[PDB]
Subunit: 97 residues, 4 copies
């Protein structure tokens, strides 16, 4: 069990009930892959380093989790098949909250 930071970029044009739904799917994918969610931050819109789906902005979500390292790559895969997930990046936690 290792602590990771999961950085999710979502489609910037979702309304609030679409946004809450994507968040619920992300939490169930987290729980189903063995993750203990310790911190969630809703960061909001930011301009991307390069456009994704011809969109130069994205809605950012960050999570601090503790999960089995052998499951991380399958979780990142699962999260990437939702059409509204523009980018997933999981890094090892260096300075945990």
């Amino acid at each position: 069990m290792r602590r990771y930071e999961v950085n999710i970029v979502l489609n910037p044009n979702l309304d609030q009930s679409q946004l809450a739904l994507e968040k619920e799917i992300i939490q169930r994918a987290l729980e189903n892959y063995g993750a203990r969610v310790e911190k969630v931050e809703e960061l909001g819109l930011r301009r991307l380093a390069y456009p994704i789906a011809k969109d130069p902005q994205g809605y950012f979500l960050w999570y601090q989790v503790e999960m089995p390292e052998d499951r991380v790559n399958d979780l990142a895969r699962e999260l990437r098949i939702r059409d509204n997930v523009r980018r997933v990046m999981v890094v090892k936690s260096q300075e945990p909250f």
Copy 2:
């Protein structure tokens, strides 16, 4: 004028009026070096990658600024002389809010 992210780690044991005071000194140092403050986040306590002043935790503050690049190193210097500033790290902004 370039956009930067300023990451400040403060002494974790300050009370709220000590904390508000350090924040005011940081804002005046920012304005005095030509910075336009666009975003401020108070992140809270986190465990450091290595202890500083035998303290393994720090109180984190993040700022998104736009300022003259020729002033950045003098600003980082100025911020580092307050006794309660444990660490200053300025990076170029990649995905601005």
Copy 3:
């Protein structure tokens, strides 16, 4: 045209002619998406933050490129369909060589 760093992790178990072949496909994908390759570094084996394809190590390649930002996401996609590419991560260059 913006400068980016492309971080490629390859299968750690390739022999030298397999490795040179993957490198040639990566260069033609780079040229075909409008990239000017300015620097290439062959970093070697490193232990991954989490295992990918049940492999806890990967062979690292880094590139400093200048390319049209509107093409970056399609290039990352293209590079990810080679079976031996375990991970692609493109970030904006902050301190270019």
Copy 4:
């Protein structure tokens, strides 16, 4: 004992015997603070995110070390008092060589 990456930026205008001397002082400071040096890379000149000592470039050195975490901040301090060291940044190693 924890594994760290030490990023040193030196004055870009040193000749080769000045450079070899700074490198020797850095290795003795490393050994004297309990560090096991596992990897050293001489990266060369890069343009800085912001100028330091009115210099917009620096000569980069990277080290992968294993050392006691309680000594890291004193080592960073020691390395920063050499006039030719423009910047020291120590981060926890995530994907070690």
